[PDB]
Amino acid sequence: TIKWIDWVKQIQSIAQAGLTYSKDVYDIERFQQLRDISISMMSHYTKTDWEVVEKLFASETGYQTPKVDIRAVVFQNEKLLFVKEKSDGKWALPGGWADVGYTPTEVAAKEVFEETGYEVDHFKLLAIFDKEKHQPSPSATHVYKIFIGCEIIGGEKKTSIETEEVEFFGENELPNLSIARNTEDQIKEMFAYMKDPQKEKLID
Amino acid sequence: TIKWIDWVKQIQSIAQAGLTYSKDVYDIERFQQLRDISISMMSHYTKTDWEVVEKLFASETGYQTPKVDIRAVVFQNEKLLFVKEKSDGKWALPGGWADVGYTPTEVAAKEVFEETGYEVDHFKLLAIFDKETHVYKIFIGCEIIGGEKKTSIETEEVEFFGENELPNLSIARNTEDQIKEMFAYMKDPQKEKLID
Ligand SMILES: O=C[C@H](O)[C@H](O)[C@H](O)CO
C-alpha cells in the first residue's frame, strides 16, 4: 500500500536507461537530473544519506533489470539443507547474489561449497519467484530468486566465520527463517517438488 | 514541508521538455513513460505527505548481478512466433530486458502484446541460458488466448515459422541452439529443462 516507492523505482530505472542509450547531450543531462531527483526523494523519505542512497539505488550501468538471487535446494532423507548466519542468527537455503561472470549453476555450486563445505552437481531448474509479489516490506530493489536443485557428490560439512551452523530440517521442524533470504511459502513449494519432482515448475 | 510535490513537478516539467524536443523514438518513449508516472503520482496523496520508510535501505549493499533478458516461446501448431527487429532486420522471439516492477511472466505477456498484438497465458518455465555485459536469458512458454496480429514501427513483421523454414536469426536475442532447444521442448514435452 506504499505506492510512492514503486513510482520512484520506475523513475530511476528510466533515468538509467536514458543515461545508457541516449546520444542527445540535452536528453542525457535530463536523465541525470531525473536520476538525481530519484536519489533526493529516496534520501529524504527513508532518512538515509544522499550519497549512500546513490551507491545503493542509482549506481548501476546499462538497462536496469531485477537483480538475481540463487537458492540451492538440497535434500537428504527428505530433509532440506539450511545454513545459519552467525551475525543475524537466522536460517536460509545456501545461496546469495549471482556474481557477474558466473552461470546460475556455478553460483549455486560456489555458494553451497563456501557456506556448507559440500561439493554439488546434477542441477535441476526448480522455480523463479518474484521477491516483490506478496513481499512483507517495501523494497528499494527488485529481485528474481532462481531455485536450483542440486545433489551432494562430495566434500564434508564445514562452518565458517559467516556460517555458524549447517543442518538438514524436515517440513515439520523448520528453523527460524531469514524471510529476506527465503519465505515460508518458497520452502513449502520446495517440499512439494521433493514429494512430486515431475510437478510443473513455479514461475511468478 | 511536503517535499514530494515540488520534486514531482520538476519531474513533470523535465519530461514535458524531453517529450517536446527529442527526435529519437526511444528517448520520446522514455519521456512519455516519465510523464505517465508523474500523472499517476499527482492523482494520489491529495493532502498527505509520503510515508517515511526509515528501514528501506537497512540490508541493501548496492551489489550488482547479471541482467535478465526474457524470451516468450509461443507455438501455434508446431510453428514458433518470431518478430523482424527494427535494429537489424533479423528475427527473434518476442522479449527483451525484464523491467523493474514486473514478474517474469508479466514481462513475457507485455513483450508479446506490444511486439505482436497477441494476449498470452498458460506460462511454463522452459530454460535459463548463459554462455559466459553478463545476462541470464529466461525462456518462458505461453499460449495465445486473445488479441490479433499487428505490425508496428519497431516490429515490421510478425510470422510463425517451422523448424526447417527458420528465418535469418538475430543471434544476440536468440542463438540457433536456443531455438533448436525450444523445438525439442515442443516435440518432447517434459524434456529436461536446461539451466546453464
Ligand atoms: O534494449 C532495449 C532498449 O529499449 C533500446 O535499446 C533503448 O531504447 C535504447 O535505444
Author numbering:
A (entry chain A): 2 to 205
B (entry chain B): 2 to 133, 142 to 205
Article excerpt on this structure:
The two recently opened beamlines for macromolecular crystallography at NSLS-II have launched the microcrystallography field into new territory, with flux densities up to two orders of magnitude brighter than those previously available. In this study, we highlight the capabilities of the AMX and FMX beamlines at NSLS-II by describing structure determination from single crystal vector data collection and two methods for multicrystal data collection. The advent of next generation synchrotron beamlines has necessitated the development of new strategies to fully benefit from the increased beam intensity and smaller beam sizes while minimizing radiation damage. The high dose rates, in conjunction with the newly developed ultrafast raster scanning goniometer brings formerly time-consuming serial crystallography measurements into the minutes range. These new opportunities mean that inhomogeneous large crystals can now deliver high quality data collected from their best volume, and crystals as small as 5 to 10 µm can deliver one or more complete datasets.
B. cereus CDP-Chase is a member of the Nudix hydrolase superfamily, which are a family of enzymes that hydrolyze nucleoside diphosphates linked to some other moiety, x. It is a bifunctional enzyme that can hydrolyze CDP-choline with the typical nudix reaction in addition to a non-nudix exonuclease reaction on RNA. Here, we have described the determination of two CDP-Chase structures cocrystallized with ADP-ribose. For the sake of comparison between the single and multicrystal data collection methods, we collected data of CDP-Chase on both a single crystal and using the raster data collection. A total of 119 partial datasets were collected and processed using the Python scripted workflow described previously relying on DOZOR, XDS, POINTLESS, and AIMLESS. The dataset was refined to a final resolution of 2.0 Å using iterative rounds of refinement with REFMAC5 and manual rebuilding in Coot. As might be expected, the Rmerge is much higher in the multicrystal dataset compared with the single crystal (35.7% compared with 13.6%). Since Rmerge fails to take into account higher redundancy, both the Rpim and CC1/2 were considered and found to be reasonable (13.7% and 94.1%, respectively), emphasizing the need to look at multiple measures to assess data quality, particularly in the case of datasets derived from multiple crystals. The level of detail observed in both electron density maps is comparable, and the RMSD between the refined structures is 0.11 Å. Despite the less favorable statistics for the multicrystal dataset in both the collection and refinement stages, the similarities of the two structures highlight the reliability and applicability of this method when larger crystals are not available, even for ligand or small molecule bound structures.
